[PDB]
Symmetry: D2
Subunit: 213 residues, 4 copies
């Protein structure tokens, strides 16, 4: 069993992106006999596609968990749906602001995550980690990668499990926001890394249950 976890580089003027640290901390670890691979994706349309595709082909994971930063979000949120569209509110790190354009022409308008979102949310709660199910991952790069991942699964038969997880700003990222108006929510990095690691565990456990029953 191989698990692929991805995070993103900094964007929107942000100095850092917590998901990038998460990808690095989990890269190369092992949960039982399962090997986890952590890779960081660029916040650039097209380029991120090429990288995601190349990484998936390379590793051929059984489970793919894509993590992204959700500014303003107060808790961990597991994405339920991926949409076949791009309507970036802001441009990507290359200055590309794509509006009302499909991700994969002719492909399904949307894909449901294949991760045990309910079970993942349940395990997080037992761990005292606030978490809820989100019904929209936006239409920027996070939804982009989540849709592509799920499309790959439906077209290539792998990864069997794929989904997306959004994490709040981490505390240190709010320091600057303070001297600029209001103050958005945050969650300590340690809790965010544990949440993602817990999603991996629940997925792996659910897989063993499927390949047996």
């Amino acid at each position: 069993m191989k698990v692929l976890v991805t995070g993103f580089e900094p964007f929107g003027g942000e100095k850092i992106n917590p998901t990038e640290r998460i990808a690095k901390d989990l890269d190369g670890i092992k949960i039982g006999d399962a090997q986890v691979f952590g890779r960081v994706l660029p916040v650039v349309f097209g380029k991120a596609k090429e990288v995601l595709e190349k990484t998936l082909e390379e590793i051929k994971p059984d489970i793919a968990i894509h993590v992204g930063l959700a500014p303003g979000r107060s808790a961990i949120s597991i994405e339920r749906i991926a949409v076949n569209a791009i309507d970036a509110r802001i441009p990507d790190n290359e200055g590309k602001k794509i509006e009302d354009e499909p991700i994969v022409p002719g492909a399904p308008t949307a894909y449901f995550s294949t991760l045990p979102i309910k079970k993942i949310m349940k395990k997080l709660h037992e761990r005292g980690i606030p978490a809820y199910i989100s019904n929209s991952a936006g239409l920027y790069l996070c939804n982009y990668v989540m849709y592509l991942s799920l499309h790959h699964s439906a077209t290539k038969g792998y990864p069997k499990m794929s989904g997306f997880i959004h994490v709040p700003y981490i505390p240190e990222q709010i320091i600057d926001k303070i001297g600029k108006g209001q103050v958005p929510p945050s969650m300590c990095y340690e809790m965010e890394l544990e949440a993602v690691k817990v999603a991996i565990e629940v997925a792996l456990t659910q897989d063993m249950i499927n390949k047996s029953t």
Copy 2:
């Protein structure tokens, strides 16, 4: 030097109150040659005043930092003002819903905190802890306590430094909320505990400076 740190017991159906854990964790601690005293207060008007007075009388702290829970707050908040009034929406842990009633008749309409709130907030940011100055501590028990402490300071000459700090919900407190509205913001306990400790450290440093000029 003696420092009094207070916290509160659970209130409003809440299973816990992080300020209670904070008070107990800092009790009996020493910061340099200073002795910290941690005390838990009841969420009952009158009874809280009774305990506050006796505690201040018994210890005669040089510095008094009162901590409380502020549901919905997304960062640490240091109170700048205590108002001489009691107008609560929800009744205390007794059933008495006191509305429109002075805390101490004839006493000043408001008192300014005597803690170095600016220096405190500065250190918090350097430590990566999101904080800001609040210009209203409410008009419930938290403001009640902050007002009485400052009033005691002006009538008895001690403590020379008195203030109030509000802390966001703790992660595990958010679990019991997912079907209601948008998940409330939280801050991990460890960061809240450190935040209060830093306030004590900064207040201690400010005091050693007062005796120099």
Copy 3:
């Protein structure tokens, strides 16, 4: 040209539903050369589908605009996508709380609204009415109706244009909210009524350009 506009009855404890008045005020009042029908739907699973199917079959509208109440929303929001799922956070008006279930088994995971959402938003802005594109209509009855309507359109070829609009609370609804908890956003009825009429106008305009090529 026939235009069908729907609203919902009261739910979630509220005494009224602004979308119900909107449907009633618009009913019968022609807009240009098109007839407008305003119908109210029940906030009940199953029953609302029957009522919806019957209304569409009866009228056979060229354009259907469904309106719903979105508590907590601060501006007009135009739904972009309908998802084939039901996961009520609260039960319907008959105590039914369906979880993790499709609306139409084997039907597309999701449908894109066929209304001129971007032009509707631009026009509303010119009229001084705050509006934005929402990427999730929730998974309660509003999404339920949105999906069924878009599915009908794909299955029967009509209505040619179908979409959903969410309106904030109206002022009078916030009154009893002020007491407990916080104060949710609202928008005066007159503006919400105007916004929906505007949407119809913009829809009618886009319809001509389509048939005129």
Copy 4:
């Protein structure tokens, strides 16, 4: 009976200020035998104090209701207390930012509004207008005038009744805020105008405290 109602000019970044319109629309009207005066204050420290002083001296109002814009607020708010301090987070219209500075040295730390705040909030509710009592009007220009007005009353004897009311953004102001991030709350100008007028009506009704056998 002479009533004074003031509003402010556009602060900074806003092309308009609803209170400026309210002041102008209410100027000259009469409520029974009471005459209402509407004056607009500059958003500059010092200059605002000067203008406020001349205006009060000239008119010698029996009731003073100052109105200001509170971005983000979702309902009408009635200020309960004015604090003797200035802590600007943004430079004024002129170009001077003040941090921790008394408005009137030696003057009381705070002044309670002398308007029938409770009576006012109740009447607004009856009229279907969401409103609540605020316990902090900030420490910028709005608090500045509120304090000066209440100080003038206590030292010069007039106005007998003085207070402050904050109003949310009006719809048209949100339009440009939509292309930035989370859409802030708003309230139609018509309701804000009526809210202020209602505050006056209640203020005058309460002034009947001159009834005898």
